[PDB]
Amino acid sequence: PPYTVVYFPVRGRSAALRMLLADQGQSWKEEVVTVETWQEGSLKASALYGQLPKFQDGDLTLYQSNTILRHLGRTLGLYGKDQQEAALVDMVNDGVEDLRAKYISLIYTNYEAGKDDYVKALPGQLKPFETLLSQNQGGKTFIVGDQISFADYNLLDLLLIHEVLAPGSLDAFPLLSAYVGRLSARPKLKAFLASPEYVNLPINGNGKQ
Amino acid sequence: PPYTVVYFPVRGRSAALRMLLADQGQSWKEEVVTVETWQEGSLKASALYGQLPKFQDGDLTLYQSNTILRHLGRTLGLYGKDQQEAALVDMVNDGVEDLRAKYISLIYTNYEAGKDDYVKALPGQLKPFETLLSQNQGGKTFIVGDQISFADYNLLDLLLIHEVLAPGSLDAFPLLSAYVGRLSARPKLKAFLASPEYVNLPINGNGKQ
Numbered sequence: 001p002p003y004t005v006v007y008f009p010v011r012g013r014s015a016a017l018r019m020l021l022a023d024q025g026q027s028w029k030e031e032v033v034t035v036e037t038w039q040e041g042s043l044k045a046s047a048l049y050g051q052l053p054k055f056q057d058g059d060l061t062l063y064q065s066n067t068i069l070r071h072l073g074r075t076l077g078l079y080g081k082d083q084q085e086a087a088l089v090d091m092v093n094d095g096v097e098d099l100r101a102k103y104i105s106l107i108y109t110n111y112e113a114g115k116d117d118y119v120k121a122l123p124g125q126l127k128p129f130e131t132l133l134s135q136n137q138g139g140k141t142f143i144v145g146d147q148i149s150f151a152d153y154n155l156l157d158l159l160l161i162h163e164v165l166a167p168g169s170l171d172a173f174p175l176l177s178a179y180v181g182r183l184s185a186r187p188k189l190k191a192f193l194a195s196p197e198y199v200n201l202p203i204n205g206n207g208k209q
Numbered sequence: 210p211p212y213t214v215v216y217f218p219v220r221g222r223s224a225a226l227r228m229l230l231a232d233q234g235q236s237w238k239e240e241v242v243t244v245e246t247w248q249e250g251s252l253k254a255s256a257l258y259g260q261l262p263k264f265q266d267g268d269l270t271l272y273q274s275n276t277i278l279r280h281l282g283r284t285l286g287l288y289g290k291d292q293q294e295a296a297l298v299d300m301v302n303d304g305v306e307d308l309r310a311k312y313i314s315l316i317y318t319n320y321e322a323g324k325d326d327y328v329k330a331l332p333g334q335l336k337p338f339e340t341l342l343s344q345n346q347g348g349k350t351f352i353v354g355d356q357i358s359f360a361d362y363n364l365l366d367l368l369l370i371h372e373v374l375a376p377g378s379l380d381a382f383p384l385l386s387a388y389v390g391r392l393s394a395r396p397k398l399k400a401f402l403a404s405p406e407y408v409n410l411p412i413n414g415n416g417k418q
C-alpha cells in the first residue's frame with residue numbers, strides 16, 4: 001500500500017478488487033478516467049495493453065484485473081492456506097474469468113440478440129460453483145477452504161451482476177443464494193456496497209445490464 | 210508428481226504445459242481423448258467445467274490450463290524470484306491468454322473470413338511483449354527477470370503457433386524472434402520439439418492452423 005485504482009466510472013472489472021480492499025478494511029484512492037480523458041490518448045499510450053484497470057500498489061504499477069486480484073491475494077493472505085488451496089483458488093477464478101468474458105461479450109458486443117441464448121446457457125454455467133461449494137464443508141464457508149480468498153470476491157461480483165441480468169437465476173442454486181446472502185452481510189462489505197462510491201456507478205459502460 | 214495430462218489429441222491448451230515439463234526434465238503420461246469418446250459424455254460430466262485440459266498431479270486433480278501453468282510454476286520455481294516478479298509473470302500470462310482467446314476464436318469460429326484481418330492486426334498485438342522484453346535487460350534472457358517462468362512457456366507456444374499462422378510474422382519484432390530460438394535451443398525442449406509426439410500432433414484439431 002497505498003492503493004490507487006485507475007478506471008472508468010463503471011463497476012466493470014474493478015468491482016471485485018474494490019470489494020476485496022473494503023472487506024479487508026483497506027482504503028484507496030479512486031482515479032477516474034472518463035471517455036473524454038481516455039479519448040485524449042495519454043493514459044492508453046502508456047498502459048501495457050492499452051486497457052484499464054490500472055493499479056498502483058506503493059511503488060508497483062500493475063495492469064490486468066486478475067493480476068491485481070492475485071497480487072492482493074498474495075499480499076493480504078487471500079490465496080488459501082497451502083499449495084493445494086492455492087491451485088483450487090485459481091481453478092475457481094479462472095472459471096469466474098471464463099463466465100465474465102462471456103458476460104462482457106454479451107453486453108458490449110451483442111446484448112439484445114444474444115440475451116436469450118446467454119440466459120438459457122446460464123444454469124449450466126453456474127452449476128459448477130454450486131458443486132464446488134457443496135464439496136467444501138457443505139457450502140457453509142467459502143468457495144475454497146475455510147478462509148476467504150480473492151476468488152470469493154470475483155465470484156460474488158459475478159453472481160450479483162447475473163441477478164440483475166436474469167432476475168431469479170439463483171433460485172435453482174440454494175448454496176449459492178445463501179453464499180451471496182452471507183458474504184454481503186460481512187460488516188465492512190455491507191457498508192461498501194451501500195457507499196455512493198459503488199451505488200452511484202453503473203455496472204457497465206454502455207447502458208446495458 | 211507423477212503427472213497425467215487428459216486432453217484431445219491436439220497441442221491446443223496443453224502445448225505450453227508440456228514444454229514446461231519437458232524442459233524441466235520431467236516425464237508424464239498422456240490420456241488421449243478422441244472426439245468420439247468425448248461424445249459418449251461420461252468424462253464431460255465429471256469435469257468441473259465440462260471441458261479439457263484435465264491434469265492430475267499426485268493426488269491433485271486440476272482443470273483450467275493457466276491453473277495447471279500456475280500450479281507448476283509454484284512447485285517447480287517458475288514464478289519469478291520475488292513478489293513483484295510474481296505479479297509481472299501473471300501480467301504476461303494474462304496478456305498471452307488474451308491473444309490466445311482471440312486466435313482460438315479465429316481458428317474455430319471464423320478462419321476463412323477472419324484471417325487477413327487477423328494477421329493485419331498481429332504486429333500491434335505482438336508488440337506489448339516486445340516492449341516488456343525490451344524493458345528487461347534489453348531482451349537477452351526471459352520475459353520477466355533472469356530465470357524462466359510459466360509465462361515464458363505460454364508465450365513461446367503462443368509465438369510458435371502464430372509462426373505457423375503467418376510464416377514470417379515475427380520479423381517486424383527481431384527481439385521476440387531470438388527469444389524463440391534461445392528457448393528452443395535448450396537441450397531438453399529442443400529434443401521434445403523434435404520428437405514425433407510433438408511434430409505428429411495436430412495444433413488445433415480442425416485441420417486449420
Ligand SMILES: CCCCCCSC[C@H](NC(=O)CC[C@H]([NH3+])C(=O)O)C(=O)NCC(=O)O
Nearest residue numbers: 008012013035050051052053064065066205
Ligand atoms: C471506453 C469505455 C470502456 C469501459 C468498459 C470497460 S474497460 C474495457 C477495456 N478493458 C478491458 O477489456 C480490460 C481487460 C483486461 N484483460 C482485464 O481483465 O483487466 C478498455 O480499457 N477499452 C479501451 C481500449 O482497449 O482502448
Ligand SMILES: CCCCCCSC[C@H](NC(=O)CC[C@H]([NH3+])C(=O)O)C(=O)NCC(=O)O
Nearest residue numbers: 217219221222244259260261262273274414
Ligand atoms: C477436436 C479437438 C478439439 C480440441 C480443442 C478444444 S478443447 C476446447 C474446450 N476446452 C477449453 O475451452 C478449456 C478452456 C479453459 N478455460 C482452459 O483454458 O483450460 C473443450 O474441452 N471443449 C469441449 C466441450 O466443451 O464440450
